[PDB]
Design a protein around this ligand. Structure first.
Ligand SMILES: OC[C@H]1O[C@@H](O[C@H]2[C@@H](OC[C@H]3O[C@@H](O[C@H]4[C@H](O)[C@@H](O)[C@H](O[C@H]5[C@H](O)[C@@H](O)[C@H](O)O[C@@H]5CO)O[C@@H]4CO[C@H]4OC[C@@H](O)[C@H](O)[C@H]4O[C@@H]4O[C@H](CO)[C@H](O)[C@H](O)[C@H]4O)[C@H](O)[C@@H](O)[C@@H]3O[C@@H]3O[C@H](CO[C@H]4OC[C@@H](O)[C@H](O)[C@H]4O)[C@@H](O)[C@H](O)[C@H]3O)OC[C@@H](O)[C@@H]2O)[C@H](O)[C@@H](O)[C@H]1O
Ligand SMILES: OC[C@H]1O[C@@H](O[C@H]2[C@@H](OC[C@H]3O[C@@H](O[C@H]4[C@H](O)[C@@H](O)[C@H](O)O[C@@H]4CO)[C@H](O)[C@@H](O)[C@@H]3O[C@@H]3O[C@H](CO[C@H]4OC[C@@H](O)[C@H](O)[C@H]4O)[C@@H](O[C@@H]4O[C@H](CO[C@H]5OC[C@@H](O)[C@H](O)[C@H]5O)[C@@H](O)[C@H](O)[C@H]4O)[C@H](O)[C@H]3O)OC[C@@H](O)[C@@H]2O)[C@H](O)[C@@H](O)[C@H]1O
Ligand SMILES: [Ca+2]
Length: 728
């Protein structure tokens, strides 16, 4: 397999779209900022454009786990150096061991060392940090807090080799929830803070503080450069230290919560300052811990480098009416929240939010007071004050990064001007994609933000499909009536019918009175070529068909849970299904299915898809089982001998001189992982991505563009929607 040069970019959703658990400023170089994602890699700030640049896109599908960024550390001695602790899950959801990634240039290129344990970039408590830290006097030294009881680890050769600090007393005892696989692991050692003043440049820093997720004993200190460790006397129990920050006046500020987050509510929190000079602990909690108004973790912690009495903390989570952002200018003696209660409804805001860079952030919804869209946020596990600009703040939310450039205006009775600061970040998990033959070039179904019509690939959409939904999980259009679409969804927050129909190419949506039998909605959807029927296969539910736009539903005969269903693109009566190792055809619009008795089939399939303009042409994407085609409606299939792995399959405009739509897949050909195109109906393939453009997990959706030769749209799991075109 040979390669052809392509240009790759994101289709713009705008504003990130997911949870970035941390932002890290460099301590010595102005405008040097990094941001870490739960499932979407890491970014470096570009001050010339005020946009973020993705750093880890070289990771191919076999290293998807390394888009899970547990911690990021930026070198204060040599700002060219940056390190990442990478690995998405501590369970068996992905097979990779964790790794420390190292760069000298500054995230442009990487090397890695694989560790003997896993990281948890997308685990509970992921906004607690930073777990990875560089010694500010001797930058050869790095420390790493780990999950799962592996304790504290250390490198003394610029992150190349790693060993356990055996003298560290406590790897952590707190576990989010032992009753489930996802939540059962020890949260562990959560942050490392060096006291720079304890040594002189060139020498290993002697005094080191370590936070541990342990309600009985959480704060540790070494005074001999990490040889021995002791709990700090007088420390509070029994909450969990999210963040610690050592200010220039010797005060170690620490935020505490009763859970690790990020989703928890009701809710206890504390904020403390430890005087590292005197050994005194002082409770500076904005809302007294004893008060029932104290109803959330304190999580985010920022300290102004230019004034150690200036500090900010955030709630995680009030959830209602909005979050709290508290500011103190007297070292926590007194605090002010960024909003106050007035005459209920009714709230007094010390801020404005400008969402012009990501207008979907208001959810297209005017709220009933005291609620207001767009919100300050939620899941605000990290807040930063620029160490070189007291007027600049940034904080994270479950959907974006917000920030301001006039922070100290608050101190003089003006409003903080908050705006989206996540331009260039695209972290959505995309579940389905269609590129219809008329209308917009792309219509998406995405996790958390539902999905969008994409009129212009380079301009972010203004609103999501259906604001009452939580995730769009499947979308299809009627091939011969391409203005007609169906969207299926999850709706965690509202009792709304979880399929919607559009008559205007996905711009406006309505819900029917009834659903296919389902527990949580979701699943997939297939629309008849002529729009006369729709098959919804909801999550953990049997395929069901409607011939009256969801007024009534009937279970499709002979199918069942897990069936993979697609419609023919020419004949509205024909639908196809792969179910329990067998292939099925319907010739009555989805009402009944019959086993075609195909003599050769893969054991299982991820996706099946019919070809526009070719009745009875059906392709099977069987992952490591390969790529298969039928041209007789699925009575016989041929396995293509020139494709190893095909996770997904899609179609775009035919190449000149060719008699078939161009075919696009992700997977593996001749021990090369990536994305591939065939212009000659699968006879020959070319690699269209390259080593620098992997984008991780690409096994949910792919489509060509029926109107633009060479263009391909690919759903990623944490890098949004990517699209490629041949280089010019
Ligand atoms: O999920 C559907 C489908 O996944 C198929 O596998 C994929 C997948 O493999 C990895 C793993 O993915 C988990 O889902 C991830 C998802 O991929 C991410 O996009 C999403 O990221 C969030 C992120 O957390 C936020 O921070 C950010 O802002 O937004 C993004 C985008 O929305 O995270 C989820 C995981 O969610 C959980 O963890 C993060 C928390 O934020 C979140 O709240 C939490 O959600 C809860 O999870 C619990 C689990 O107890 C529970 O489901 C709650 O309902 C939910 O709210 C999949 O969950 C996981 O299944 C995938 O690993 C595969 O697991 C198979 C076993 O699955 C069963 O058991 C777990 C259960 O969750 C499943 O529902 C159930 O089916 C196992 O056989 C297989 O070996 C594992 O690989 O992504 C990579 C891709 O290549 C894979 O194809 C999978 O094939 C299919 O079976 C199905 O699970
Ligand atoms: O989660 C639904 C569940 O909530 C149970 O209640 C518990 C739960 O509450 C969270 C919700 O609180 C609401 O406020 C409540 C308040 O908690 C009450 O104290 C008060 O009395 O009433 C208030 C008003 O009802 C908030 O309004 C909700 O927004 C919040 O739900 C979370 O919503 C966010 C997304 O919000 C945005 O998008 C939707 C839009 O409507 C909203 O305006 C926007 O702000 C989700 O965050 C995203 O989560 C995904 C991951 O999601 C997966 O994992 C977590 C699971 O919760 C999801 O179901 C699953 O799909 C992540 O990738 C994104 O990055 C995030 O942005 C949260 O997932 C929603 O939970 O939790 C706190 C606890 O104290 C409450 O008791 C309730 O019992 C259930 O009936 C059910 O509604
Ligand atoms: Ca931070």
């Amino acid at each position: 397999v040979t390669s052809v040069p392509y240009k790759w970019d994101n289709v713009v959703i705008g504003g990130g779209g997911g949870f970035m658990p941390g932002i890290v400023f460099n301590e010595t170089e102005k405008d040097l900022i990094y941001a870490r994602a739960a499932i979407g890699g890491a970014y470096r700030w570009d001050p010339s454009t005020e946009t973020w640049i993705p750093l880890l896109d070289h990771f191919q599908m076999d290293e998807y786990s390394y888009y899970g960024v547990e911690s990021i550390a930026t070198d204060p001695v040599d700002p060219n150096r940056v390190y990442i602790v990478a690995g998405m899950y501590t369970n068996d959801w992905l097979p990779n061991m964790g790794a420390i990634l190292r760069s000298t240039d500054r995230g442009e290129t990487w090397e890695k060392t694989i560790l003997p344990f896993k990281m948890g970039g997308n685990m509970p408590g992921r906004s607690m940090g930073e777990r990875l830290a560089i010694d500010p006097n001797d930058n050869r030294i790095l420390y790493l807090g780990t999950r799962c009881g592996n304790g504290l680890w250390r490198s003394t050769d610029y992150g190349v080799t790693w060993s356990k600090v055996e003298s560290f007393p406590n790897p952590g005892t707190y576990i989010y929830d032992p009753n489930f696989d996802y939540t059962k692991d020890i949260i562990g050692v959560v942050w490392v803070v060096f006291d720079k003043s304890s040594s002189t440049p060139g020498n290993p820093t002697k005094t080191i503080y370590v936070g541990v997720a342990d309600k009985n004993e959480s704060i540790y200190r070494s005074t001999d450069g990490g040889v021995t460790w002791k709990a700090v006397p007088g420390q509070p129990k029994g909450l969990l230290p999210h963040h610690g920050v050592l200010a220039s006046n010797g005060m170690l500020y620490i935020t505490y919560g009763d859970t690790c987050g990020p989703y928890d509510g009701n809710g206890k929190g504390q904020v403390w300052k430890f005087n590292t000079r005197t050994g005194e602990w002082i409770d500076i909690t904005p809302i007294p811990y004893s008060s029932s108004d104290n109803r959330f973790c304190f999580a985010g912690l920022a300290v102004d480098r230019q004034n150690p009495d200036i500090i900010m903390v955030t709630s995680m989570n009030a959830w209602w009416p909005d979050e709290y952002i508290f500011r103190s200018t007297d070292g926590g003696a007194t605090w002010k929240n960024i909003w106050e209660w007035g005459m209920y409804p009714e709230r007094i805001l010390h801020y404005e939010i400008d969402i012009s860079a990501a207008p979907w952030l208001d959810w297209g919804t005017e709220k009933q007071l005291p609620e207001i869209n767009p919100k300050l946020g939620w899941m605000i596990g990290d807040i930063e004050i620029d160490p070189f600009n007291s007027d600049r703040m940034m904080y994270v939310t479950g959907a974006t990064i917000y920030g301001c450039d006039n922070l100290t205006d608050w101190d003089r009775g003006g409003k903080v001007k908050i705006e989206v600061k996540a331009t260039g970040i695209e972290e959505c998990a995309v579940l389905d994609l269609v590129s219809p033959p008329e209308g917009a070039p792309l219509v998406s179904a995405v996790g958390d933000l539902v999905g969008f019509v994409h009129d212009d690939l380079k301009v972010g959409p203004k609103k999501m499909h259906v604001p009452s939904y939580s995730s769009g999980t499947g979308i299809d259009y009627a091939e011969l009536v391409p203005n007609f679409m169906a969207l299926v969804a999850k709706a965690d927050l509202y009792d709304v019918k979880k399929i919607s129909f559009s008559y205007d190419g996905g711009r406006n949506w309505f819900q029917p009175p009834n659903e296919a039998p389902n527990s949580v909605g979701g699943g997939s959807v297939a629309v008849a070529a002529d729009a006369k029927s729709v098959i919804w296969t909801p999550e953990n539910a049997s395929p069901a068909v409607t011939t009256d736009n969801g007024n009534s539903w009937k279970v499709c005969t002979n199918l069942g849970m897990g069936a993979v269903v697609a419609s023919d693109r020419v004949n509205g009566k024909k639908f196809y299904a792969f179910y329990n190792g067998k292939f099925y055809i319907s010739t009555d619009g989805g009402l009944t299915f019959t086993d075609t008795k195909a003599p050769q089939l893969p054991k299982s399939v991820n996706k099946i898809k019919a070809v526009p303009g070719k009745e009875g042409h059906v392709w099977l994407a069987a992952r490591e089982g390969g790529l298969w085609r039928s041209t007789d409606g699925g009575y016989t299939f041929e396995k293509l001998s020139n494709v190893d792995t095909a996770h997904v399959v899609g179609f775009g405009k035919a190449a000149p001189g060719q008699d078939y739509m161009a075919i696009y897949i992700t997977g593996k050909i001749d021990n090369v992982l990536g994305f591939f195109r065939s212009d000659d109906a699968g006879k020959t393939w070319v690699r269209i991505n390259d080593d620098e453009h992997g984008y991780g997990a690409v096994d949910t959706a792919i489509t060509g563009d029926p109107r633009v030769y060479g263009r391909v749209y690919i759903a990623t799991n944490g890098r949004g929607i990517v699209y490629g075109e041949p280089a010019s």
